[PDB]
Write an enzyme that holds these catalytic residues in place. Structure first.
Site, mmCIF file in Angstrom:
data_model
loop_
_atom_site.group_PDB
_atom_site.id
_atom_site.type_symbol
_atom_site.label_atom_id
_atom_site.label_comp_id
_atom_site.label_asym_id
_atom_site.label_seq_id
_atom_site.Cartn_x
_atom_site.Cartn_y
_atom_site.Cartn_z
ATOM 1 N N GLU A 29 0.876 -1.383 0.223
ATOM 2 C CA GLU A 29 -0.157 0.040 0.132
ATOM 3 C C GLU A 29 0.826 0.745 0.060
ATOM 4 O O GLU A 29 0.334 2.184 -0.667
ATOM 5 C CB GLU A 29 -0.847 0.243 0.839
ATOM 6 C CG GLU A 29 -2.422 -1.213 1.026
ATOM 7 C CD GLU A 29 -2.722 -1.079 0.442
ATOM 8 O OE1 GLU A 29 -2.828 0.040 -0.351
ATOM 9 O OE2 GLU A 29 -4.216 -2.121 -0.359
ATOM 10 N N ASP A 46 -6.799 6.653 -5.340
ATOM 11 C CA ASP A 46 -6.155 5.142 -5.305
ATOM 12 C C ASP A 46 -6.170 4.679 -6.643
ATOM 13 O O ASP A 46 -6.764 4.946 -7.444
ATOM 14 C CB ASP A 46 -6.697 4.342 -4.219
ATOM 15 C CG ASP A 46 -8.105 3.570 -4.368
ATOM 16 O OD1 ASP A 46 -8.894 4.065 -5.740
ATOM 17 O OD2 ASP A 46 -8.784 2.782 -3.869
#
Ligand SMILES: [Cl-]
Ligand SMILES: [Cl-]
EC number: 3.2.1.17
Length: 162
Positions: A11, A20
């Site tokens: 991440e 994202d």
């Protein structure tokens, strides 16, 4: 290696609101803020999540705190889920980390939908599960991360992460 370090590799860490891979407003270590297009709706959720007026920016400690809650919730979601629990219970420690990772990224609902792969994992048919897991939007959209998780499932080691 452990779940925390694993997810921190997949991440990354960002201290300012970002979008994202799907285009949603996120902050920290993969903490989804909102699926709404509004940056304001995102700043609002953020302030609600942190308990202060952040103006879209947080410190490391705040990011870590969110991450600690998120992993915890991921685990608890798995344990509460009728489809996931038996899989998790059947797995060794490394492979459990792999399932937690999928859950964190895609939510309980989504993972729970991988019916066939889940059955293969429970049966310990590693190679077959790895093949089936690859036939998914997940794998097509984030192939490098998917490959690492899948390798973790196939092998039972942390090699893809070393
Ligand atoms: Cl929250
Ligand atoms: Cl990727």
């Amino acid at each position: 290696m452990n779940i925390f370090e694993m997810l921190r590799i997949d991440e990354g860490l960002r201290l300012k609101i970002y979008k994202d891979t799907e285009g949603y407003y996120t902050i920290g270590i993969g903490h989804l803020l909102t699926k709404s297009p509004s940056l304001n709706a995102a700043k609002s959720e953020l302030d609600k999540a942190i308990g202060r007026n952040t103006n879209g920016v947080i410190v490391k400690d705040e990011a870590e705190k969110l991450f600690n809650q998120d992993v915890d919730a991921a685990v608890r979601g798995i344990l509460r889920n009728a489809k996931l629990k038996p899989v998790y219970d059947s797995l060794d420690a490394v492979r459990r980390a792999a399932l937690i990772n999928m859950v964190f990224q895609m939510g309980e609902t989504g993972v729970a939908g991988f019916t066939n792969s889940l059955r293969m994992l429970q049966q310990k048919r590693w190679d077959e599960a790895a093949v089936n897991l690859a036939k998914s939007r997940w794998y097509n959209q984030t192939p490098n991360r998917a490959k690492r998780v899948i390798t973790t499932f196939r092998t039972g080691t942390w090699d893809a992460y070393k």
